[PDB]
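BUG: 3D viewer hangs when loading the predicted structure for this chain

Environment: internal workstation, default settings.
Expected: structure renders.
Actual: progress bar stalls at 90%.

Input used:
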Amino acid sequence: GTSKLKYVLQDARFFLIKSNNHENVSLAKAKGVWSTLPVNEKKLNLAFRSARSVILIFSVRESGKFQGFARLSSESHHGGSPIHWVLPAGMSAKMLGGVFKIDWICRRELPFTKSAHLTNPWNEHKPVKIGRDGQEIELECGTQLCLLFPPDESIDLYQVIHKM
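Structure tokens produced before the viewer hung:
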């Protein structure tokens, strides 16, 4: 069903995450972690304290798809288990410092063709697929977007609900 998912998304905040490669999204799916640039890290840390749920919706550049979505379970933390992110040009491990823990809600893909009816008020009402890494997605648009994804029957939202 979709009732627990709707409960997790109630009064949530949503942010678009753009990754330059699939490798980092695969690593994030396997390890339950994400790292972003310091400008976005500050925004996510502020959002984490402000809302019952902060949802990251992931899209790999040039893929034409979203690769899933996840809920922040912590603010960013430094030190500890390092992450072998595949770093683009100019990208360094020090900028990808600060690791957030995340709980995946859906690890399935959604093609951009399926979200063409959803526009984001916080990005000039452009289609929600359009946006820089870190772009906030307004509540109603983000909720509809998450509900478009195929259900991920490998995930039990019971443990997610308890963290709220």
